[PDB]
Amino acid sequence: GITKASLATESFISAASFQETTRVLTEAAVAGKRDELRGLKENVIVGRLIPAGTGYAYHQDRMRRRAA
Amino acid sequence: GDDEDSHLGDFIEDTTLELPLDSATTESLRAATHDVLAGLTAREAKVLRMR
Amino acid sequence: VYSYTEKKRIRKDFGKRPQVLDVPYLLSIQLDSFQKFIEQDPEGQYGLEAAFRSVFPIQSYSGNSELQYVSYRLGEPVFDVQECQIRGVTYSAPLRVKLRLVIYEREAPEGTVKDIKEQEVYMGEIPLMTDNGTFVINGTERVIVSQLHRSPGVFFDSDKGKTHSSGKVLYNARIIPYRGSWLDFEFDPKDNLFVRIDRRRKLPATIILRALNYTTEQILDLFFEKVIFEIRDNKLQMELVPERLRGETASFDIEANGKVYVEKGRRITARHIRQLEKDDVKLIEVPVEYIAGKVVAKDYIDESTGELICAANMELSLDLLAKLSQSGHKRIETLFTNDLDHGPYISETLRVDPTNDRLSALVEIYRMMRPGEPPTREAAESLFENLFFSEDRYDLSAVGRMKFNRSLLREEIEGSGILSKDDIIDVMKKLIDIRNGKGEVDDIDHLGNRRIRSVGEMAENQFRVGLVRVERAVKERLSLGDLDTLMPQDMINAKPISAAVKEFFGSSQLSQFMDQNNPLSEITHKRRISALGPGGLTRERAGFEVRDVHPTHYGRVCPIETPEGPNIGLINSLSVYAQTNEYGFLETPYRKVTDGVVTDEIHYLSAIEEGNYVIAQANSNLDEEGHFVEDLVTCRSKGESSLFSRDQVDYMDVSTQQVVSVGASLIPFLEHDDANRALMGANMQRQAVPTLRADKPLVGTGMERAVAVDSGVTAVAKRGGVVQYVDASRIVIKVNEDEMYPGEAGIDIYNLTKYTRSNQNTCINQMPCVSLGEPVERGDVLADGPSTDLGELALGQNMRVAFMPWNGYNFEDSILVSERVVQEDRFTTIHIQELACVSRDTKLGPEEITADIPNVGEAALSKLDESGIVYIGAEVTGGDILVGKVTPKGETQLTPEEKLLRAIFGEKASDVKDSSLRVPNGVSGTVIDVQVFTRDGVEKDKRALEIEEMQLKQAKKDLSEELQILEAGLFSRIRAVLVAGGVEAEKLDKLPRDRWLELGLTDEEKQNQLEQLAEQYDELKHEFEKKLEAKRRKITQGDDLAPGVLKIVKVYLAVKRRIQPGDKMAGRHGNKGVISKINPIEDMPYDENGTPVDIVLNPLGVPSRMNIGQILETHLGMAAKGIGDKINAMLKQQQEVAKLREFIQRAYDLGADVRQKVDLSTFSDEEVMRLAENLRKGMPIATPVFDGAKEAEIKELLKLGDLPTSGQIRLYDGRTGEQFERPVTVGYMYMLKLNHLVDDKMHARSTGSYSLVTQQPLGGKAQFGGQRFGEMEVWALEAYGAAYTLQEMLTVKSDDVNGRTKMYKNIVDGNHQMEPGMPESFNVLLKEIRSLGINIELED
Amino acid sequence: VDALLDNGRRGRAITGSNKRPLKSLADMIKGKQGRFRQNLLGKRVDYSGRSVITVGPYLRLHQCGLPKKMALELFKPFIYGKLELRGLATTIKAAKKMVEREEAVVWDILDEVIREHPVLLNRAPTLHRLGIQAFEPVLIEGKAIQLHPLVCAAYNADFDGDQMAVHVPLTLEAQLEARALMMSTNNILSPANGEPIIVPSQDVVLGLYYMTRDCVNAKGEGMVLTGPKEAERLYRSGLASLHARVKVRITEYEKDANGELVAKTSLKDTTVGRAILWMIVPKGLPYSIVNQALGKKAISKMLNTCYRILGLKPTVIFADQIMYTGFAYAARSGASVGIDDMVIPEKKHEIISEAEAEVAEIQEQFQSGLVTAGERYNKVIDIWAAANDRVSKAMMDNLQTETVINRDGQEEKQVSFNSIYMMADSGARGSAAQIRQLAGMRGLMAKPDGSIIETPITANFREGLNVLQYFISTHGARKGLADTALKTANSGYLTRRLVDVA
């Protein structure tokens, strides 16, 4: 479904800012999860440039500069 | 209010802050007094920066 | 014969059907309820007496003491209404109750007391209702709103085919008390009866019956019918009743007495049963297979062994019947059972039931109510006998018992307030019958299932809660140890009771601030039926079933007045004629219809009785005697409305307005509007701001006068007389001798209210409408309130509207207002603010209110007098200082270069921070009052002394004027008395006027009246002195302020808002709209005579919204102003009185078969010129709600004027000068001015004050806050490619604490660039996640 | 501890002095009032204000009116910077006092900083992407934000007290995104379907429908004109009616070449209204795009055709010109609405009497038991629905063509100039089901349970309903209101689930 596929995401902040926070946070804590900030809600919450519009060039540069 | 989301914690200001206007005036005063002290002799400028 | 307030200006009535019942007192509900509360009832059924008798007497815990109740008396208030609103305290009256303490003797249950003592104990204060129906709670006028809740009783409700896969309908019965535990029986998909208490885990239903001390045999006797089985040494005979046999299959030959009735393959029909009835069939032979399913009833114990052959409720088989056959048992009682008529529900419940005795059932009950603690023999019995069987913890009480007995079809109407065994058994039997098919379920929304609580009942409950508190306290104190020779002034604490009553009146959901910006707004706020509140449904747990108009709202609750929004249909408004029952239910009047004659006796039919009759319609023409015109008259029997014969009809509606409320019956031509637009018009009529000079409705409904008078705004006369002196602030009436009391020489004095603010900051101001030397009558209007014109509710002004599209300046819903409308000062209105400046006690010292303020010039301190406070009358604008105040400030510690500036230029640092009160940014108006309150130990400044001296002088003057007017009237009456019987023309004024009160007269009522008048004079002379002394003591005394505040200064500004683009203006028919331009006079479309229109509306708003009422109101206003212009032309040159009378009576005669004949033959040649001078601005017209002024009458009236009968004239353009094609519709539409002013809506913020935990801006316009850039706007910026605008919206502008100062300095510095950083709310979130046992970190 | 980490999970919540449960840490994070949705995804924002909105038709669709007071309060740092840059102030304190006194030299600075600086006008339920658009301010004397008429469809705004919040973009990239991405002239097509979103709405389509019509005998019928300029000079001089069938010589340009415009000239059988309107259409469009009655769909199609052929700049200029001329001729038409414009059919009472006789016949045949109660109910419903359809047909056929005027002869039919019919046919705020409740009958209403009442209400709003009919027709209105008041809560949650899955 829409809700069940939005709650099952690799990123856990884009799922914890969705409906249920206690369950998502407990599972992501026991699993030792790691959020790599690839979507739009993660970069909105953190307060940086969205990877979609005018920030796409910036995010491409930050990606290619990494490990190179 | 007669609802949620109107909690008393949303109405309390932060009185431990300075206005951005205060910061701008402090920076402007700092620059202006530096330029005024520049227009004096080096010895008197140092005596006024030490006093 | 017309009332003298109705001969000034007679409103032309267009209604055809006569009215037989007068509109009731509109505020009778609030006043009657609070009269039932504070009253002395000898029977003690309702009020304070019914709470005192409900709690007291209190008996100690075998301590041989008893505190008992005797009487009470409501004390007198210390401050009246105006003083309570000025000072800021509740208008309440002390409740002092007389109690009596008695101590008992040991080994004396009801023995003689040895020591008694009685006294009067003060138990809190109860707030009092004002003259109108509003409470004054803390200076503020509040209104307690009635509630519509579910009446106590028993309600059977189905599950209407939900919550199951197959679709079986489940039935459940609920017993709702007035106070206590909810008990609920419900079915199961397996037809097992289940019970549950307080909505907890369910139990099998027979558990409570076993708890009622029943065995299984007794239950089977209660719920079933016995079938007897017999044996004549063989063949197992069965006694048969003909009725039971139906619905079975006679696969065998059913025969009796050697006669065959049924054959093989023939099932039982009705004819076979009638054959059996005719042949008197009793006993039959039946095989073992026929009895192979029957159930034994009781236990059949064996003759010899005594062992249990078979216990209660176990099905008989071949072997068990064979076993009990030879044991000596020739009688077997079994249970009759079917599949559709009698059911096996109790039997299955018993087979599921685990409990076996009373104690086992009690333990099974105690294990759900108190899970976890071990059960006990005593504890379970205490719990169950205390659940539903103790008057302390269970009440129904009276309406509950009446509903309970009515629902079970019992005869008696009043009974005990607690349950009983037969009551629960009757509920179970009724539910089983509902399951079988006999009865039918109820509906909750039915207005015979919902009560109406009011102020009296809610206040009584809240008082009884406090009484229970004080009962616990007294019983704890009374029963301890001793006696102890103490009077009952210490066992009672007054605070737990007053705290409860103040918790109700002050902070409750139903104790609302009274909207006070209209007479209509007040009178429709007091008549409100809220469904929410304590004991009522939540706004979210309200379905779509309780938000629909039900067929039993006809006459009881308005259908088209409910607040659109999140609660539509939970805030209904009471109808016009509806009133509360004796029990609480709503009822509406109806005219009794005899065999053929519609009588005039008014019977109030409730919501349950009205369904049994056949009620006619109010649009049912009678032939001037009572008989209906046609035999087929539309009626409504029970919900559904159809056609019924004239002999069949039994009741008729009383009036044609009784369906609608008091706010939706002021809309002319309601019957043409849509229902949505009528709802919006009704809801927007109560927001109209009272303008500078309220005019009149040129098209009314006849309900304006009742609303204006029955509210509290206008000052109506109490006793008829002749006006002796009218001032702008008082009116003195000289009562006629017919209405005067024998004792006093009464001349009534009416004090008017001048410019006091309301709750909504508008202005309340009463002007006299009578003139010196003019008769008045009882109930006649003397002074007009806000939005009132000679006792008629005038909410707005009527202006020359036009319907055309005008260059797009009225595009969607906008309006285009001419400049004559703003020049003529007709939509301007006076708003009165109130600013307060409290001087407190800080730790570094007090705060002064001096007029010497640092860092402020003299151009700012020009308007402050020597004491600091501003003058009265000083026109202040935005930013001007009102009350100069300073605050002590220390620990300066200036940074470097600030010390340098100060050292170079001198001017040592200021040691007091200027925190004065200044006018808010934007408002600008005169100062009309300044009040100063001081604590009871602080020295008063010069200005407070000036105010005190002025108030003392004014109070002395007012008491002197009272005494002087009353004394003048008394001496004049004594002189008049001393003329009849002892005529002395000039012998009377010679002697001093003080010795007139001792002379004599002949033998009549006047000689034992001079003594009465002397007593009145002495009483007035003492009254003047006592009032002066008390008033001086009240003025001079200190005030009781908050702990820590030294003095308060309150400044009242008067702002006058004119009109501007943005101000919302609506009409009565739900056509709102925001003004969009203020055209010059020349640009407006002028008609053929040069008169421009004043407002240009839009035509496209009519066909898609279907409020066709406004077009007809426009035409009727055109006709009324045409009549007015004709009268004004005949008056402009002094014509005659003959022609004026002829034309006026010709205007009052149209049209077809109206009531209200106004023949001007008796008017006395000065009441015609006054009438024709009040009609020169347009003849007012009344168009009742559903009675209407039909189009033929409108066209006839338009023909009576010069105006064309179409309603549309040829209109020229103002700017081009060239004529508009397609003639346009002009008329006079009544425009309101709603209270959504543009200068209360607009605000802007560049940098203000930031919140505390999350460093973000605050809420709007009072903390100078920013606009919420919520989630959906974030998505709307992600949908574009705007990733930089979004980043500066959520980092630099809002939350990130260093980048916002850096960005401000960059913007001032000429460089538009942000160094963003990270928000602060994210750091708050990291701390709040990390402060669990969860480690979350930002790693790279 | 378990009441501190998450209060109320085990047992019952502990309560403070308020006798309310107090918030733990999990309640600080969870829910609509938690840090995740109230403070991180949505924020309160500086440099922003709101006010009521009005019309202001004189604007071009890339500018909005902004009050001087709002524009002085939002643009304060820019004003301080400019005052100290140009030398009118000693420092920023003196500049602050200068803008506080509202000196006469600060309005020139305000007009300087306002010039090319967009603002973001936003309406509160921002349902779709076109709910935030950026306009260029025009300083206005007042307190109402003036909003161009053509964007009211996009905002879903109407002027009955609705208010919009404006935001200021600070940095250079924010201004360039509000100019190159979010500007009002760059959003004229919907993002859900390719159809335009700035189509003219209600006054202008009525003016353009009134302009482009034809009546069978008007002033100046049959003249031959030398161009649209002569047609306009004929109309403004009072010598020809706005709709009179004439012959005009129009020169239309077609782009049949590989990017070139070819001028061709002919003689067309048109009116004066269409010839006047042809002065506004740009080059590349044909002439059969205005030679019609020009309802609302036709205007939307004309704008779409111009956008597909010519581009963006002529489409924006065309939209502004259409709005201006539509407002002008809607004003000059004087199209009003009176009580004689709601024509009852001449044969309504005959149809109602026939239906009542037939339903009485059905009742009398029911009382003999020949039909079941349900079959009788269904037959009654079908009879009344057929009667309602016949009344509606009679009304519409009496409304659309009852006008008849002669040309040098006896009589001739044409479409009607009835005001309500023009407002319904042109698409300007009306339909054929909103009418027939004004002139015809308004049919059968339903009860709360779902059943439609057997007897319908045979009265309309021209002649009013009685007490019982008006009370019957109130449940439908309350169900409509109680569905619009709680369908938004379902839609706003569906769209949030959709946004957070994608």
Ligand SMILES: [Mg+2]
């Ligand atoms: Mg709106």
